[PDB]
Nucleic acid binder design. Structure first.
Ligand SMILES: [Zn+2]
Ligand SMILES: [Zn+2]
Ligand SMILES: [Zn+2]
Ligand SMILES: [Zn+2]
Lengths: 379, 379
RNA sequence: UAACGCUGCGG
RNA sequence: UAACCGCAGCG
């Protein structure tokens, strides 16, 4: 063999990084794509082998796109290095196009020893059908598609930016932008839920659970002459964001993330039915925000199916009554809803829905509780 | 003499007004232009006669532009009312187009009894040559072109918005946007300065003034093979913004407004020489900001001609030395510069520059003072 | 900020 | 946020 010295990264200046890796989902003015690649081996506890920055205008003629430049460089690198399994990581500012995605899928087919992971700052044309198809080509060829969070921005700053020892300072709204982008990516990749996660979290057993977490599957329908027709695109599932110093410092409940996601869809003036299936009914704060949302969204009909009633140390009845008295339709999941969620949102791998013990009894009991809560008048 | 009832305006809801009248100079997403007109008689102590809101898409098929719809409405309105002098005021979200500007000029020529004043929220395509030509067509046909400030936004909110009694709440950065837009409008209409104002402010007599104030005329040239050639557009003059609760609460010195204006020009990577003529040499804070600006703009050469040395309660020498030691070229206006400013930026109305008594003597004295200030020792 | 630019046809 | 949209050729 012949030895190749590392090639210490020629870094980008801080202002270019701050401008080009701002993860505001809708951001105009960026004409260049920046890609920061790093090649390691199977072992993550061994120092990286090589890191290189590529850039390029987003102009058609994908020949000069940074993904193609990386492909050329890394073919050379592979011919010059030991033949073993390698793990490439990308920090790319925009999501790739169809042409580059097909080239990458082809290369991964040719070189099955390379595992590629892509962290994107922003999703590029996530509403355009063909860029969604590009993301699917990539995910299908093996690559792991992810959104850059605070940790990946910090690491990119450390490894690829001319910070001069100064620490990475995050911008305003980095967690909210990350939440929106992660949800949209889950939609575009049609990400399905872990079977065990589903059974553990959606079990309508009254309280017997672990530490409280809320899972929310969502789907959209549109009105067409007194019958609802599905919208296959805006469907998926999310969970509550736990408190995080560099995320949401006090957390974000599932319902709040969901109400954040709805306006990002940029729906029409037509009537939409947004249905969700939550393992816990909304808390009081969630209920207040959903009431305000319904109060201010004429064309949106909220259907809430809870698997359990969350008792928020007292406020649950009042919150449920406000939510019922302000617009939302609220039901408790019976068998049919659990089976539909298992079929639609769960990575069932072909296995049918196994009903946990006592499902129908628990569903009827929860229905009775909800009926008593709603019909308990005040004055 | 058949009577016409006023026609109480059907107001726009606060959502639409807040979105469409935000005065961020570069604002995408607004496809409609909203225009709120009000007709008075030639008397501010008499209640307005009529007020009407028009709206319309911004693109061609100019028939449906709100400017044309107002023209049609107001021709009829004139045919139905007493023939006298009228004062029309517009609050329009975007500056008008060439077709509408020509129609308005035509109407103003046909109907000389109408005086039209236009307050624009944002300048529409202020870099496109033809929209600037439209602004010039309007100003020359008689119309008074202005930018909406806080008072005009509050007035629009009261007279045309469904505020429901709530007071007008201003958005973030309204004064800064106003300054950018006011300077750009003065450039596009090539507004010249009052002769008396020039003589009063640029007199290089040492201190003898009133509650004095700093005026800054500015010009840009660009380099082409060892000779500087003019840029006729980015030339004009501004003054310091006095403290204002609804403007800059503490004020904005002329030099700071100028350094704010420079990046709005969106200059190139080519070398530009930006020359200014200020009635007062920069204060200490101005000097610090200009030093940092030069520190971060490689391609911009600042040439400062001061008519007087401002004695900033002690710190003027250190400020001037910092400005000199950080990039800026500093001179005192001799006769030639005063006459050039009189010719270029002053509404001289044809008459030549009359040099005030003792000009050359004062210029020599100020030049000597500046030379002594710059050539003072360090350690 | 629905997100590279120029040149055009139309709505 | 250089700022209505679709279609079409090129950088
Ligand atoms: Zn590409
Ligand atoms: Zn909650
Ligand atoms: Zn028009
Ligand atoms: Zn100052």
């Amino acid at each position: 063999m012949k030895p190749q010295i590392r090639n210490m990264v020629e870094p980008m200046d801080p202002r270019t990084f701050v401008s080009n890796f701002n993860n505001r989902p809708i951001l105009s003015g960026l004409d260049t794509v920046w890609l920061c690649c790093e090649v390691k081996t199977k072992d993550p506890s061994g120092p990286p082998l090589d890191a290189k920055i590529f850039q390029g205008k987003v102009y058609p003629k994908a020949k000069y796109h940074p993904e193609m430049r990386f492909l050329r460089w890394f073919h050379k690198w592979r011919q010059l290095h030991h033949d073993q399994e390698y793990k490439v990581t990308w920090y790319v500012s925009w999501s790739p196009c169809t042409r580059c995605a097909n080239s990458v899928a082809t290369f991964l087919a040719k070189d099955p020893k390379v595992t590629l992971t892509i962290f994107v700052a922003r999703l590029y044309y996530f509403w355009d059908p063909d860029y969604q198809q590009a993301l699917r080509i990539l995910a299908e060829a093996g690559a792991t598609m992810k959104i850059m969070n605070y940790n990946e921005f910090q690491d990119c700053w450390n490894k690829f930016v001319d910070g001069r020892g100064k620490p990475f300072k995050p911008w305003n709204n980095l967690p909210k932008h990350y939440t929106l982008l992660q949800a949209t990516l889950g939609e575009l990749l049609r990400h399905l839920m872990d079977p065990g996660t589903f059974t553990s979290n959606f079990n309508n057993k009254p309280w017997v659970s672990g530490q409280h977490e809320t899972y929310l599957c969502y789907k959209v329908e549109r009105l067409h002459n007194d019958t609802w027709v599905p919208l296959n695109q805006h469907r998926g599932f999310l969970r509550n964001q736990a408190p995080n110093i560099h995320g949401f410092p006090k957390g974000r409940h599932a319902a709040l993330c969901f109400l954040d996601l709805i306006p990002f869809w940029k729906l029409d003036g037509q009537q939409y039915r947004v249905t969700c299936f939550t393992s816990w009914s909304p808390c009081f704060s969630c209920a207040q925000e959903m009431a305000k949302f319904i109060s201010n969204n004429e064309h949106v009909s909220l259907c809430i199916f809870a698997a359990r009633i969350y008792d928020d140390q007292g406020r649950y009845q009042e919150g449920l009554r406000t939510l019922h008295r302000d617009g939302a339709k609220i039901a408790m999941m019976n068998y049919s809803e659990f089976e539909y969620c298992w079929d639609t949102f769960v990575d069932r791998q072909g296995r049918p829905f196994q009903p946990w013990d006592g499902l129908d009894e628990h569903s009827q009991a929860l229905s009775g509780r909800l009926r008593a809560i709603l019909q308990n008048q005040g004055n």
